[PDB]
């Protein structure tokens, strides 16, 4: 987790530099000082990269070299129990349809449709989140 961390610290450094130079060169040499739109966007994309890179560096320090992060690693080194990978599920399409219902209720100003879409989204997200935890029916 060190290489993909360093990637994000490099991106964070560049974005911080770009935001700082934009702010300095717009606060003066511009008609209305700092643009306040590009400046904030650059600052918070710097923040985006900073959060991701900080988490990656934290994990990398927390983690011993993984086989994937280790050169000269045999395939048998990584062999073993991989985690749960969700098999077939029809809940994603229902979530998409629910959000589409809410989106059309938003575009077409139909507050009833917005509410129905929000209810559908909550129901479908519950179904997805609970899909692999719903215990057997007890009768």
């Amino acid at each position: 987790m060190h290489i993909e961390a360093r990637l994000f610290e490099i991106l964070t450094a560049f974005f911080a530099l770009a935001a700082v130079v934009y702010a300095v060169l717009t606060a003066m040499f511009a008609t209305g000082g700092v643009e306040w739109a590009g400046t904030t966007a650059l600052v918070l994309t710097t923040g985006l990269t900073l959060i991701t890179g900080t988490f990656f560096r934290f994990v990398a320090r927390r983690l011993d070299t993984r086989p994937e992060d280790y050169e000269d690693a045999e395939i048998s080194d990584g062999a073993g129990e991989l985690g749960f990978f969700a098999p077939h599920s029809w809940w994603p399409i229902l979530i998409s349809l629910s959000f589409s219902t809410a989106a059309v209720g938003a575009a077409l100003w139909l507050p009833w449709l917005i509410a129905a879409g929000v209810a559908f989204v909550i129901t479908s997200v519950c179904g997805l989140v609970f899909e692999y935890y719903w215990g057997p029916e007890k009768h």
Binding site: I75, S76, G78, A79, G80, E81, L82, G83, F84, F85, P87, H88, V104, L108, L110, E131, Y132, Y133, W134, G135, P136, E137, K138, H139
Partner: protein
């Protein structure tokens, strides 16, 4: 001494009468415990509520077209000529305490009655509950559904209303007048004259509070008697066969849950009658032949009729000095529709040839052709219903009214075909999912094989395992299969303390191994009964 009193009353009843044998026989009757089998109950429950509400409404409703000035509380209709029926509907809404609530829950119960009948019909159709033992049931049920629809029409038509009045004008007057040979004669008999005939609303009142509810009650009695004595069908399962009913006896369990379901359905209907406004007739002035509204729909169970009117392309025929109006078409439509609904099991047995006594239901996926046909019928019904709402759909969802009309026109031919194809392939795909889970077992998380980098989903066999890893495939038996280890005994033992605090470890243990033993004993008993059936 309540125990002694109960014993004495039982002895009196069994001394005067001798129902011990019969009473035991019904109290022991077994009813399957599938949720879908409760669907029909909803309709019955809704029906009961309607009766209980309907009688109440009869104590305050005066059916008549006698013109009168309101002179009542509702200011926006004062001095306006209205039929006495509309005046009394307004009085119920405003003048009698709870009258708005009572008629509101009555109309909501009518809508739930219709919708639950439709859902029950779909259930029995897709599950094939109409086969050899129970065609007559189907048939009467079909008739029953039809009656409900018409009574609903006669229900919101009772309060002489602009919306309901224009609905009467379109449907009854126009269509009856359109029928070629006797159409005008039927119109004059039904109205005792032309459309505004002064004997329409009283006749509809008689048909709606006395005649049609009585016929529906008689048909419901026949329906429930047949289901009771043609003991309910069941889905395939472990210990379930064509010659037994696996479930819960009537008295301890089935009666309690049925009564609780009636209570909860009544609660849903009361909550709707309070919080949701149904047919706000006061906004709808008294019916006048000239006044109009843009919406002008009937209740959802006749929206398919209205949509069929809208989408049918204005085709008329003109014989020798006679006219055959386009309205005629819808009548024929209904005929065919009903003629195909009432008769369907006989067409099914004539085409397929299944003339066997079928007691085990069929999963809809296991009958791709019938599932596709039912999906096609539901698609056509939905298309027609939304076509009736094409006015409102265009208003809210910005689509040109002509565009919606032509979408419906092309759809009533194309959408059924697409839905049939999709439903057929979907049913076969569900069958293949079942076969795959049988032949491989349930799926789980992925693991990377030790020596090489093979990735395997780490299945779970549902049956005996071969000498090597792969199991012996099982044989499909028409019962649902577990596609998720979720629903098996995997990761399903949360702390039984409480939501906030635990219980002592000894108590949690006792409870969890008790539940484990109970469910294992249930499985063992079902398996032993299954083996004893054949073996």
């Amino acid at each position: 001494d309540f125990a002694k009193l109960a014993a004495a009353q039982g002895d009196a009843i069994d001394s005067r009468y001798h129902p011990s044998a019969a009473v035991r026989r019904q109290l022991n009757k077994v009813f399957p415990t599938h949720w879908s089998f409760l669907l029909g109950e909803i309709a019955l429950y809704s029906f009961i509520i309607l009766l209980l509400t309907g009688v109440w409404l009869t104590l305050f409703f005066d059916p008549s077209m006698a013109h009168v000035t309101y002179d009542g509380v509702y200011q926006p209709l004062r001095g306006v000529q209205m039929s006495r029926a509309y005046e009394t509907a307004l009085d119920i809404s405003f003048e009698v305490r709870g009258g708005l609530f009572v008629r509101q829950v009555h109309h909501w119960a009518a809508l739930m009655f219709a919708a639950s009948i439709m859902v029950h019909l779909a259930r029995i159709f897709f599950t094939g509950a109409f086969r050899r033992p129970r065609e007559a049931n189907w048939v009467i049920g079909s008739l029953l559904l039809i009656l409900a629809m018409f009574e609903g029409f006669f229900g919101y038509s009772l309060p002489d209303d602009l919306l309901s009045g224009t609905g009467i004008r379109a449907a009854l007057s126009g269509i009856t007048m359109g029928i070629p040979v006797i159409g005008t004669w039927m119109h004059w008999a039904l109205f005792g004259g032309d459309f505004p005939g002064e004997i329409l609303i009283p006749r509809l009142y008689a048909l709606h509070i006395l005649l049609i509810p009585g016929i529906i009650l008689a048909l419901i009695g026949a329906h429930l008697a047949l289901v009771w004595f043609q003991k309910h069908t069941q889905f395939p399962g472990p210990g379930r066969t064509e010659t037994n009913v696996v479930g819960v006896r009537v008295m301890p369990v089935f009666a309690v849950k049925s009564g609780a379901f009636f209570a909860m359905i009544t609660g849903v209907l009361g909550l709707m009658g309070g919080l949701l406004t149904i047919n706000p007739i006061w906004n709808l002035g008294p019916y006048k032949p000239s006044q109009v509204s843009a919406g002008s729909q009937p209740d959802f169970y006749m929206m398919w009729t209205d949509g069929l009117i809208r989408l049918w392309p204005a085709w008329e025929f003109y014989p020798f000095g006679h006219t055959i109006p386009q309205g005629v078409w819808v009548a024929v439509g209904m005929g065919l529709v009903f003629a195909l609904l009432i008769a369907y099991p006989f067409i099914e047995k004539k085409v397929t040839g299944d003339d066997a006594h079928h007691n085990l239901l069929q999963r809809p996926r296991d009958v791709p052709v019938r599932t596709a046909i039912g999906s096609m019928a539901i698609a056509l019904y939905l298309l027609l219903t939304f076509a009736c709402m094409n006015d409102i759909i265009a208003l809210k969802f910005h689509i040109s009214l002509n565009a919606t009309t032509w979408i419906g026109r092309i759809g009533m031919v194309v959408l059924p075909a697409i839905v049939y194809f999709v439903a057929y392939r979907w049913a076969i795909s569900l069958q293949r999912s079942d076969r795959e889970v049988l032949e491989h077992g349930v799926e789980t998380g992925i693991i990377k094989r030790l020596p090489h980098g093979a990735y395997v989903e780490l299945h779970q066999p549902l049956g005996p395992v071969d000498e090597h890893g792969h199991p012996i495939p099982l044989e499909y038996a028409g019962a649902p299969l577990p596609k998720r280890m979720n629903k098996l005994g995997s990761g399903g033992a949360p702390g039984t303390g409480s939501f906030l605090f635990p219980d002592p470890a000894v108590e949690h243990e006792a409870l969890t191994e008790a539940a484990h033993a109970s469910e294992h004993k249930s499985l063992t008993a079902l398996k032993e009964h299954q083996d004893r059936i054949h073996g």
